[PDB]
């Protein structure tokens, strides 16, 4: 996160760290949707142009964390993955269209004050909250600057932006499975996701049932916090059926 703040303890209890066994290294963010399921960006596991192709074995999931680097002794839970699932029409060749993956935990995790699942949006929740101008929240342990590393989980609040402005900011071809977020240069308030934040959650709080819902997944951007540039996120609602599907077919 660039221009964010230190999260409060237990502020984002669904936040997960994607962790490389060796070398030990933060791969990305992810989120807990149940005691056995984690949701992240497919570009965190599979990215051929860069020979990236992580398997079950290559990673560890860390839940309940505050500090980036410290082993949070009776707070955090470290788990093994049973299986990875990538959306079959995920487009790594051109625009990261359908940038979403599911991670099935080897064993269910126990909720606590620091570990709690976020809600998946319903059509109605989506419809009412996904509006240009409405602000969502991004959290992560990624870079503080485009070009460093925080000590604690950072948070930033950003407004959803109008599709056209989204479209007009890049040479990349935007799809209906994406949304962009950020402040406009004239707005003079800044912030953004940065390196290492990827695969983390973009969440919103319903003013109706006052529950936290994950609307997006931190997907891609051009630099971090650049003027006239925006962050791009996976539209979680549009890919719900695929999510229900794999859980109904293979899990919890």
């Amino acid at each position: 996160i660039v221009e964010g703040s230190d999260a409060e303890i237990g502020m984002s209890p669904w936040q997960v760290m994607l962790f490389r066994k060796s070398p030990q290294e933060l791969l990305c963010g992810a989120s807990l949707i149940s005691d056995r399921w984690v949701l992240t960006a497919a570009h965190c596991l599979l990215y051929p142009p860069w020979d990236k192709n992580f398997t079950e074995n290559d990673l560890l999931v860390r839940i309940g964390k505050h500090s980036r680097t410290r082993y949070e002794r009776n707070i955090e839970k470290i788990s093994m993955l049973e299986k990875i699932y990538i959306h079959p029409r995920y487009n790594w060749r051109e625009n990261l269209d359908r940038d979403i993956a599911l991670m099935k935990l080897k064993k269910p995790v126990a909720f606590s004050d620091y570990i709690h699942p976020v809600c998946l949006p319903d059509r109605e929740t989506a419809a009412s909250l996904l509006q240009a101008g409405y602000k969502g929240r991004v959290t992560g342990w990624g870079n503080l600057k485009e070009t460093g590393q925080p000590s604690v989980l950072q948070v930033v609040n950003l407004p959803i932006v109008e599709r056209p402005v989204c479209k007009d900011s890049t040479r990349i071809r935007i799809t209906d499975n994406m949304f962009c977020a950020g402040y406009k240069p004239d707005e003079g308030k800044r912030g953004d996701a940065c390196e290492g934040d990827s695969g983390g959650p973009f969440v919103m709080k319903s003013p109706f049932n006052n529950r936290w819902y994950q609307m997006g997944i931190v997907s891609w951007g051009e630099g971090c916090d650049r003027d006239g540039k925006y962050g791009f996120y996976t539209h979680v609602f549009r890919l719900k059926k695929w999510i229900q599907k794999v859980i109904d077919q293979f899990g919890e």
Partner: peptide, 13 residues
């Protein structure tokens, strides 16, 4: 590295 070590006994939950 950077990262504080944990044991393989800290794993699976």
């Amino acid at each position: 590295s950077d990262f504080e070590e944990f044991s393989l006994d800290d794993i699976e939950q």
